[PDB]
């Protein structure tokens, strides 16, 4: 009657972005670049991968 | 001469709830001073955060909104207070705070009410970002449709815009 099942799940995902499929791995090496980028992305993403 | 500000109003605000162990709060902060000594994160910078971790397509649009939202004050500049606050909710929350935070994002005008025009804007953003949107093939289509269906699915009152109240319900109805 609506099929709003997969739409709700998958969508919210991209919004919070997938759980992986990005770059490769992080490591203490960056310096000239800003540290606010790696902190947010790496954190917000890996930490958001959780689902109660 | 150069201190670090917010080194007292924050720790104090805690003393109770804290989605970031003491040694953490002051942690991101220091990272902030780096990105900006004046404790001010402008769109340009934010845009670089995503454009750097996702050069694939053009997540830009998503960076303009996510940034405008991350700022509760929406003054054009994101201060540490707003940043950290999200760094936490974005992760843990122990509450439907997730549905609420999302509402703010789905409402550019953040006028407490979302608008078909706004919903599309975002949806369109997440569309021009990753490739998964391609596998979607099975049913669904351009964003214009996704939204038209959503509203008609999350809004049986047909009022052009929806409120956090109805937004929450329409959501809890997915399961
Ligand atoms: Ca602000
Ligand atoms: Ca609205
Ligand atoms: Ca409504």
UniProtKB/Swiss-Prot annotation, chain A:
Subunit structure as annotated in this protein's UniProt entry: Interacts with FRQ1.
Protein name, per record: Phosphatidylinositol 4-kinase PIK1
Subcellular location: Nucleus; Golgi apparatus, trans-Golgi network
Note from the entry: Present with 1600 molecules/cell in log phase SD medium.
Superkingdom classification of source: Eukaryota
Similarity comment: family membership: Belongs to the PI3/PI4-kinase family. Type III PI4K subfamily.
Origin species: Saccharomyces cerevisiae (strain ATCC 204508 / S288c)
Parent-protein start and end of this portion: 121 to 172 of 1066
Function: Acts on phosphatidylinositol (PI) in the first committed step in the production of the second messenger inositol 1,4,5,-trisphosphate. PIK1 is part of a nuclear phosphoinositide cycle and could control cytokinesis through the actin cytoskeleton. Involved in the response to mating pheromone.
Swiss-Prot record, chain B:
Positions annotated to bind Ca(2+) 3: 155, 157, 159, 161, 166
This protein's record includes keyword Lipoprotein: yes
Residues in EF-hand domain copies: 22-57, 58-93, 94-129, 142-175
Principal subcellular localization: membrane
Coiled-coil ranges (or none): none
Binding-site list for Ca(2+) 1: 71, 73, 75, 77, 82
Pfam families: EF-hand_7, EF-hand_8
Highest taxon of the lineage: Eukaryota
Location(s), subcellular: Bud membrane
Membrane-topology descriptor: Peripheral membrane protein
GO molecular function: calcium ion binding; enzyme activator activity
Role of this protein: Regulator of phosphatidylinositol 4-kinase PIK1.
Subunit note: Binds PIK1.
Other comment: Binds 3 calcium ions via the second, third and fourth EF-hand. Present with 7160 molecules/cell in log phase SD medium.
Family: Belongs to the recoverin family.
Protein name, entry field: Calcium-binding protein NCS-1
Species the sequence originates in: Saccharomyces cerevisiae (strain ATCC 204508 / S288c)
Gene: FRQ1
């Amino acid at each position: 009657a609506s099929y709003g099942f997969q739409v709700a799940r998958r969508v919210l995902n991209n919004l919070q972005t997938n759980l992986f499929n990005t770059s490769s791995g992080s490591d203490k090496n960056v310096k000239i670049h800003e540290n606010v980028a790696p902190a947010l992305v790496l954190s917000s993403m890996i930490m958001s991968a959780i689902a109660f | 001469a150069k201190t670090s500000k917010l080194s007292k109003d924050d720790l104090t605000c805690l003393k109770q709830s804290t989605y970031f162990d003491r040694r953490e709060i002051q942690q991101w902060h220091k990272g902030f001073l780096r990105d900006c000594p004046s404790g001010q994160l402008a769109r340009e910078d934010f845009v670089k955060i995503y454009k750097q971790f996702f050069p694939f397509g053009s997540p830009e649009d998503f960076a303009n909104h996510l940034f405008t939202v991350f700022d509760k004050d929406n003054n054009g500049f994101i201060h540490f207070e707003e940043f950290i606050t999200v760094l936490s909710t974005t992760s843990r929350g122990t509450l439907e705070e997730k549905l609420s935070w999302a509402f703010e994002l789905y409402d550019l005008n953040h006028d407490g009410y979302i608008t078909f025009d706004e919903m599309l804007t975002i949806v369109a953003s997440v569309y021009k970002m990753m490739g998964s949107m391609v596998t979607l093939n099975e049913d669904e289509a351009t964003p214009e449709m996704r939204v038209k269906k959503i509203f008609k699915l999350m809004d049986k009152n047909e009022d052009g815009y929806i409120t956090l109240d109805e937004f929450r319900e329409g959501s809890k109805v997915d399961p």
